[PDB]
CSV table of C-alpha atoms in Angstrom, one decimal:
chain,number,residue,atom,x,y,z
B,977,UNK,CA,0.0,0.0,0.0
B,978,UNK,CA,1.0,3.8,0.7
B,979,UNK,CA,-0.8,7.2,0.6
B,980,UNK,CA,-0.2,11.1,-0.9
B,981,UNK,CA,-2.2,13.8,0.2
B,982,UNK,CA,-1.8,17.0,-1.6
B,983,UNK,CA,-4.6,20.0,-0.3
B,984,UNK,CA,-4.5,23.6,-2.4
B,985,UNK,CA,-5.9,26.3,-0.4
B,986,UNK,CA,-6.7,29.6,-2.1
B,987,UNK,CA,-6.5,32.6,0.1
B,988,UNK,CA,-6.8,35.9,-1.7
B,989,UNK,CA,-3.1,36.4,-3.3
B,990,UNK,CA,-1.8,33.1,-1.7
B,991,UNK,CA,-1.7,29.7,-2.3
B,992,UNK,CA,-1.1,27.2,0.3
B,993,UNK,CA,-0.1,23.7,-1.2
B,994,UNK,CA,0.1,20.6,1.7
B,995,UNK,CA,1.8,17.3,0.9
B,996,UNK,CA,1.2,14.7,3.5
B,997,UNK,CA,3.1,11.5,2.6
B,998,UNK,CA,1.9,8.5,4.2
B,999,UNK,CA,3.7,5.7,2.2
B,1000,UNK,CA,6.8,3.8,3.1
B,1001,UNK,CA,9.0,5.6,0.8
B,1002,UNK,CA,10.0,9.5,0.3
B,1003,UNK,CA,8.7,11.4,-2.0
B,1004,UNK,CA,9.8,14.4,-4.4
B,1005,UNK,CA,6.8,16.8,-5.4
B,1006,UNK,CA,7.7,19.2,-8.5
B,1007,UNK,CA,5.2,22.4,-8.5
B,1008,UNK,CA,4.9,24.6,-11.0
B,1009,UNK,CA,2.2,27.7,-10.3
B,1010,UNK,CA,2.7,29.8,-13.2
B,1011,UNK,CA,6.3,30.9,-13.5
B,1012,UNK,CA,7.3,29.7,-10.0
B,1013,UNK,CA,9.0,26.0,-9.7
B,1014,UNK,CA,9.1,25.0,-6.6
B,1015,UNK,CA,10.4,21.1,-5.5
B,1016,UNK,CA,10.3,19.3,-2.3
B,1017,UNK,CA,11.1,16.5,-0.7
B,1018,UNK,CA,8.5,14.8,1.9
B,1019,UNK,CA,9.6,11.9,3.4
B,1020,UNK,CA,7.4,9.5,5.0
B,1021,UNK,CA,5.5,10.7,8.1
B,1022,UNK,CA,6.1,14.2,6.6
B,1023,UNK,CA,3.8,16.7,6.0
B,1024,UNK,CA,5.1,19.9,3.9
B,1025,UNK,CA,3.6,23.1,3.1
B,1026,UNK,CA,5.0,25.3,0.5
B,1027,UNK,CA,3.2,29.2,-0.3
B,1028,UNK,CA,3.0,31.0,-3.3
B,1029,UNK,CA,2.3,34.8,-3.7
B,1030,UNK,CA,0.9,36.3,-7.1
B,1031,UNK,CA,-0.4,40.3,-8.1
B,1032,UNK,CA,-2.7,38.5,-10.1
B,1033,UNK,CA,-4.5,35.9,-8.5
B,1034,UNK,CA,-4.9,34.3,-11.8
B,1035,UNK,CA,-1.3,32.8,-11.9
B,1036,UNK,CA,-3.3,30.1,-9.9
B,1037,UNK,CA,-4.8,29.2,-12.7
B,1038,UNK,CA,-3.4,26.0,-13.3
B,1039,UNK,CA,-1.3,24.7,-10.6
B,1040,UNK,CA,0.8,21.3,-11.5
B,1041,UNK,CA,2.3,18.9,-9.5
B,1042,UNK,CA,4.2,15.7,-10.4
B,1043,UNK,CA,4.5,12.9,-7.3
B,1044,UNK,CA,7.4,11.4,-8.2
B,1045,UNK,CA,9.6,8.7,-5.9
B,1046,UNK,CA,12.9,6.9,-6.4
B,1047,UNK,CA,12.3,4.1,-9.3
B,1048,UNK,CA,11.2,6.4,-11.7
B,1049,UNK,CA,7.6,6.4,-11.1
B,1050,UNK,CA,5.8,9.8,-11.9
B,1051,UNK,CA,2.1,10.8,-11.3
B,1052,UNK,CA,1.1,14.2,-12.8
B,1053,UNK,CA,-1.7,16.3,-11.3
B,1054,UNK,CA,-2.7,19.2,-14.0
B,1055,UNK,CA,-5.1,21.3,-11.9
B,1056,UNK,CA,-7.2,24.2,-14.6
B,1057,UNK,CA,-9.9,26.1,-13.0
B,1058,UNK,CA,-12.0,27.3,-16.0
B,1059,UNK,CA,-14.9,29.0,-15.4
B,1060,UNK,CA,-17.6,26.9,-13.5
B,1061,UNK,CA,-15.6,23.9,-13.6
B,1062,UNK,CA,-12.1,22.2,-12.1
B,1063,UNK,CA,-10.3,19.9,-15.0
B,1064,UNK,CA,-7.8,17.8,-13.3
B,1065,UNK,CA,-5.4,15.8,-15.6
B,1066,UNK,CA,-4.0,12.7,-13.6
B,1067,UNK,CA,-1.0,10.3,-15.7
B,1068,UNK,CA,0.7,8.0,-13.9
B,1069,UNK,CA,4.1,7.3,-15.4
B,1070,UNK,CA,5.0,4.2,-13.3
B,1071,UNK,CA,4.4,0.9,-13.5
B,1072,UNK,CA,1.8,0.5,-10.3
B,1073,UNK,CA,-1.5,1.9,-11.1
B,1074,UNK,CA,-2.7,4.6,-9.0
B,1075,UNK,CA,-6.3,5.5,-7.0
B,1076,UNK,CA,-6.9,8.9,-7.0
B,1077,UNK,CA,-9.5,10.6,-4.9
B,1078,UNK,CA,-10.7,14.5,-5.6
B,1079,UNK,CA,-12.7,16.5,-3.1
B,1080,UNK,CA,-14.3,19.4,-3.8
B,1081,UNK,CA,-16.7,20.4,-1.2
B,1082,UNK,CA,-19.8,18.1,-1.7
B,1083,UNK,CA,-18.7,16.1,-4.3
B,1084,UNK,CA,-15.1,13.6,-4.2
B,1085,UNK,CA,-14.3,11.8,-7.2
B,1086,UNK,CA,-12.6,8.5,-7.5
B,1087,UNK,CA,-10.5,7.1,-10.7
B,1088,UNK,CA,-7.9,4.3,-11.4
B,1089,UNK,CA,-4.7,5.6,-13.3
B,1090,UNK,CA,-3.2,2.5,-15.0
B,1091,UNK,CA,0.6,2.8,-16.1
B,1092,UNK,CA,1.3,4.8,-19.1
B,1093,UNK,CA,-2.6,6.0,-18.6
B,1094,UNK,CA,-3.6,9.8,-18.4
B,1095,UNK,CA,-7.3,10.8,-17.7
B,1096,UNK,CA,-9.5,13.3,-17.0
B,1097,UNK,CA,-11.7,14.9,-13.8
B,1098,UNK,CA,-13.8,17.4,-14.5
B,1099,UNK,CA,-15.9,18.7,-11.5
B,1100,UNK,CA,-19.2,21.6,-12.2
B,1101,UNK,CA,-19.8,24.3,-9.5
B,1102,UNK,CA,-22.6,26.9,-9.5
B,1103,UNK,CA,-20.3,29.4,-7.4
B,1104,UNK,CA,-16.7,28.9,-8.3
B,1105,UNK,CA,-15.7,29.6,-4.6
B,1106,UNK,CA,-16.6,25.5,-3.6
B,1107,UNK,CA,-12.9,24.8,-5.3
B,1108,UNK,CA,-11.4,27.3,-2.6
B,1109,UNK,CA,-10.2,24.2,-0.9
B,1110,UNK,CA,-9.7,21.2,-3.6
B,1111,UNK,CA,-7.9,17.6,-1.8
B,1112,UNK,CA,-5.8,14.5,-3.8
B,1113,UNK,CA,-4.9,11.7,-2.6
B,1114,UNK,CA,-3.0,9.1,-4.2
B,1115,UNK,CA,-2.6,5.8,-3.1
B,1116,UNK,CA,-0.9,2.8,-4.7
B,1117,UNK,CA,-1.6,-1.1,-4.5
């Protein structure tokens, strides 16, 4: 088994992004929130918060983070927030395949990434506010 938890939290000009990592192994996160790369290591037990700022709070846009852990594997999380709706683009570039849970508020969605596999989560809102706060988890077999 083992677990990755990544939360986003919007707050005005800020962007909070928590890794929790409760596998066996560490883990390396690559973000990328506009123009700003930002990589970190969370080892297991960890939990790691890194902040971006932004003059336009439409640098947050699409924030991307790729999971990846010693042996190659890679899972890539493309978050776009367009509109109404939240488009998340999951590809797991390992050989496990992957769970991975969304929450949004009400609504959590659940797919199964297989290796070499990249699809889609797109989630509807009335007020785009209820994505203020999206959660991922990841876990592997």
């Amino acid at each position: 088994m083992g677990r990755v938890e990544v939360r986003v939290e919007f707050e005005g000009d800020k962007m909070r992004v928590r890794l929790r990592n409760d596998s066996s192994t560490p883990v390396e996160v690559h973000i990328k929130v506009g123009d700003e790369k930002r990589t970190v290591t969370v080892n297991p037990g960890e939990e790691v918060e890194v902040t971006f700022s932004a003059n336009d709070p439409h640098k947050f846009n699409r924030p991307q983070f790729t999971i990846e852990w010693g042996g190659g594997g890679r899972v890539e999380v493309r978050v776009e927030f367009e509109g109404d709706k939240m488009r998340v683009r999951l590809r797991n570039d390992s050989s496990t395949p992957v769970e991975v849970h969304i929450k949004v508020g009400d609504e959590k969605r659940t797919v199964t990434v297989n290796p070499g596999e990249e699809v889609e989560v797109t989630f509807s809102a009335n007020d785009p506010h209820k994505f203020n706060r999206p959660q991922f988890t990841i876990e592997w077999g």
